[PDB]
Amino acid sequence: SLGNVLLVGLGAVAIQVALDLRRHGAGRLGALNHPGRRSQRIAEALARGACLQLEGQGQHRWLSGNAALDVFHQDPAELRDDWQTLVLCVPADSYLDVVRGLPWERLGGVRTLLLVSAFIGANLLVRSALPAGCQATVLSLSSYYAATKVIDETQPLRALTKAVKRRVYLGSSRPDCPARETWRRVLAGSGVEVVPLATPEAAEGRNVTTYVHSPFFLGEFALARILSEQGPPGFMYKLYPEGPITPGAIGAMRRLWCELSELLRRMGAEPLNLLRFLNDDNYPVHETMLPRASIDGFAEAGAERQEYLLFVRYAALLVDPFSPADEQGRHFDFSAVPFRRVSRDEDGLWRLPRVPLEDYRKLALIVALAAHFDLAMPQARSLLASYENAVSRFIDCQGASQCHPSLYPIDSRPAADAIYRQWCS
Amino acid sequence: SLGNVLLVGLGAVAIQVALDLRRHGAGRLGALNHPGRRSQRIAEALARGACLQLEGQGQHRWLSGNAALDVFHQDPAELRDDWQTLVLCVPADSYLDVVRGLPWERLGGVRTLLLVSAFIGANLLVRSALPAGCQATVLSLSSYYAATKVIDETQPLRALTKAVKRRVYLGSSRPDCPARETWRRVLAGSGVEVVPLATPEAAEGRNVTTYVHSPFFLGEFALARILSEQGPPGFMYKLYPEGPITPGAIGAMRRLWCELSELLRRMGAEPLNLLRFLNDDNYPVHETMLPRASIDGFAEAGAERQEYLLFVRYAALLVDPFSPADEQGRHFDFSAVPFRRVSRDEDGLWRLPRVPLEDYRKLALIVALAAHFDLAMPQARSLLASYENAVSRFIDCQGASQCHPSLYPIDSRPAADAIYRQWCS
Ligand SMILES: NC(=O)c1ccc[n+]([C@@H]2O[C@H](COP(=O)([O-])OP(=O)(O)OC[C@H]3O[C@@H](n4cnc5c(N)ncnc54)[C@H](OP(=O)(O)O)[C@@H]3O)[C@@H](O)[C@H]2O)c1
Ligand SMILES: NC(=O)c1ccc[n+]([C@@H]2O[C@H](COP(=O)([O-])OP(=O)(O)OC[C@H]3O[C@@H](n4cnc5c(N)ncnc54)[C@H](OP(=O)(O)O)[C@@H]3O)[C@@H](O)[C@H]2O)c1
Ligand SMILES: N[C@@H](CCN[C@@H](Cc1cnc[nH]1)C(=O)O)C(=O)O
């Protein structure tokens, strides 16, 4: 079945998954999280008798439950060969470090490894990093299937899920993989439809953040908010000047979707209809704003129409059109997610929030991979250089000695080269 | 050059105009307001010593002043022939009525008649009703040049100008007409730029409400709010579902602009660039939402681009992007102007607000006029039909005995025919 399940990285995602895993019945449930303040707080909470707790918000409160953890490790040396399934709940830009850091000499019994938020090439990269003869199947879930946050870092085991996707996709490094069906069931428990696809890259090409975060949060407006310490953070999904969404950002979104689509075709995977994907799998609007015919025909509609429809879609979501109206006729301000900004870590060094550091690193790797398929991806590269220039000016102003080295530019070509070699086996 | 000036319709517009007239320099100032409760209060206020009182709000505090009314009539037949200039400050739907009611055969001293909110064809309609040989020049202003309101019907001659337009247009029935220059200076005193055009219809075709109110407030969503009794009233300039703006309504806007522009051309008037007119004459947005080259090139853009640009324009104006940002990074909610709705009058009868009643009437005339130039105007007719069917069902439900006669069907063909006859003269 799933056997004993080890969660790697015990954050908001891991707690949602733990709930769904305990509904399905796992056998033993463990977690490994690298040493640090969070791990320390987790161990204290578990030692005081706490359990993982998940709160569903609003119409999701039916999801609420508690789940028990059998073992927690903040030290890989105590791991023994007790685990059949590994679930990576760490940031996706850390998958390589995490897979290299795992004690595989002690994990020979692992037969499945699930990437909960994969990107194009993640399955191949993880496999290139496995030890020789490893025969764990690697599974790529397209995106994390919910929106979950740890409310209060002082209660590190309590998370709140505010939203749930209608549907996600799941590929496997092993053809016709039986494990996909198990995960379909596991996630069905929280209301999500899991669509199995014949290839990990087909699933990885349906990672929603690659298509949305890249054009919106790697641009000038977003980085200016993110790299700022004074003034209001702005809003991530509002129109200029309150947020980053402009016709030019929408054009970037269209042009990058075309590039990513061509890469997926060159790796043997069917691209997606971006508008139907956003509307049908993530969050819809009314037929008056987006006609069903326009959604289904998006890929054939021509660039100007395509960009008009994407803009309408994001404008139509500035509020939640299905939320209840207030006394005055207003709907919930769905678009007001403030931007998280740079902050100083415990060593005094400036650090970047995961938006956009994670989005930058995923795209840099996808671009470097695409060069092996002779694909230049100029729109992706333009968004990379926009991020690089903004961060470089922030180091200039702030001083290098003040900045965590994750702010410096990272070389994606070794990883791309390992991905491509793995692909050509 | 203005001589003695008779203001016809002593309401908010007239008070503002009176003060602008006095700043420039005029003769005696008279007013003609037809009988009614308002004229009764005016008469008492005048008997108690009242003046015309203008107050400018905030920025415009410098507009404030008082002006004496030298004469007040309610009965057109009591007018003496001591008037060189007439200014029609009544609703435009009453221009024909007013001109037909005046004893022109003993008003041979009138040299100028100014229509303050002239619709397409208004100049020609007014001239239609003048006696042969009448030598008065008819001037057409594209629209009233401020936003003005009598605060309290208790102090009937005290008005509040809360804002002043950027620019209006003025055309004259007399080619290269002198009095045009005089009125340009008079209104410039308020801060508006007045642009003389070569014919009356060139100016009449630059009324913004014809192009915006028609598609937005004659549609199904706006009428459902306007005819609504209970529930929140909604917002005139927000997107569906909080307001009437949808891709479909923007399509209506583009198509109606096409139809109006062809009518103007057949009438000898150069039409306008809708996008340029909205941005430069009404409220601008930043270059990143609407590039100047896109604004200037709008007429030549192609229908899909044009519709996208129009939608961007209204979406960009959901908040005032030039308003100061608050602590949270939000701008002023410029789009939350609630719909005014039907209400019972003095006699208990349901009345429609000026929006959309005056807009329906203006558009009905334009469509009837256009038929004489062999122009079907199907978009305009679809909007008229939507209004008529909605208002017709409201009468069905409430009962005609409960509805004011202004809600009943109208036939604008007799006025259309006279405009056309005068135009062919
Ligand atoms: N949360 C969401 O709703 C959401 C939405 C979309 C996508 N995602 C995806 O899911 C990922 C996880 O989100 P999350 O919210 O669960 O994150 P999170 O709460 O920050 O948790 C990640 C966990 O992994 C550990 N971790 C972080 N960085 C690591 C590294 N370099 N090496 C090893 N362990 C590390 C963390 O511990 P420390 O804090 O101690 O490092 C923490 O326990 C996101 O990064 C993204 O890829 C999540
Ligand atoms: N005020 C603005 O800011 C503004 C802005 C844009 C457009 N406009 C346009 O300009 C027009 C005038 O506006 P307003 O605000 O001044 O309206 P108002 O306050 O209604 O004033 C109209 C005045 O004319 C009188 N009147 C109406 N019909 C008449 C007739 N046939 N003969 C003589 N007097 C008559 C009214 O008397 P009763 O009340 O007794 O009928 C009233 O005193 C409006 O229709 C409006 O669409 C005004
Ligand atoms: N949040 C997602 C990215 C997709 N966001 C949604 C829009 C949205 C979310 N909240 C307010 N608007 C979208 O673009 O369709 C993720 O990170 O996976």
Swiss-Prot record, chains A, B:
Keyword set includes Iron: no
Membrane topology type: Single-pass membrane protein
Upregulating conditions: Is part of the operon cntOLMI that is negatively regulated by zinc level through the Zur repressor, which leads to transcriptional activation of this operon under zinc depletion. Highly induced in response to airway mucus secretions (AMS) treatment.
Keyword terms: Cell membrane, Membrane, NAD, NADP, Oxidoreductase, Transmembrane, Transmembrane helix
Compartment list: Cell membrane
GO molecular function: oxidoreductase activity
UniProt key word Cytoplasm: no
InterPro entries for this protein: NAD(P)-bd_dom_sf (IPR036291), Opine_metallophore_DH (IPR016935)
Active-site residues, Swiss-Prot/TrEMBL: 213 (proton donor/acceptor)
Catalysed reaction equations from the record: pseudopaline + NADP(+) + H2O = (2S)-2-amino-4-{[(1S)-1-carboxy-2-(1H-imidazol-4-yl)ethyl]amino}butanoate + 2-oxoglutarate + NADPH + H(+); pseudopaline + NAD(+) + H2O = (2S)-2-amino-4-{[(1S)-1-carboxy-2-(1H-imidazol-4-yl)ethyl]amino}butanoate + 2-oxoglutarate + NADH + H(+)
Main location: membrane
Residues given in the record as NADP(+) binding sites: 10-13, 33-34, 148, 358
Role noted for this protein: Catalyzes the NAD(P)H-dependent reductive condensation of alpha-ketoglutarate to the intermediate formed by the adjacently encoded enzyme PA4836, namely (2S)-2-amino-4-{[(1S)-1-carboxy-2-(1H-imidazol-4-yl)ethyl]amino}butanoate, leading to the production of pseudopaline. This is the last step in the biosynthesis of the metallophore pseudopaline, which is involved in the acquisition of nickel and zinc, and thus enables bacterial growth inside the host, where metal access is limited. Therefore, this enzyme probably contributes to Pseudomonas virulence.
Family: Belongs to the staphylopine dehydrogenase family.
Quaternary context: Homodimer.
The protein's name: Pseudopaline synthase
Organism: Pseudomonas aeruginosa (strain ATCC 15692 / DSM 22644 / CIP 104116 / JCM 14847 / LMG 12228 / 1C / PRS 101 / PAO1)
Lineage, highest ranks first: Bacteria, Pseudomonadati, Pseudomonadota, Gammaproteobacteria, Pseudomonadales
Gene for this chain: cntM
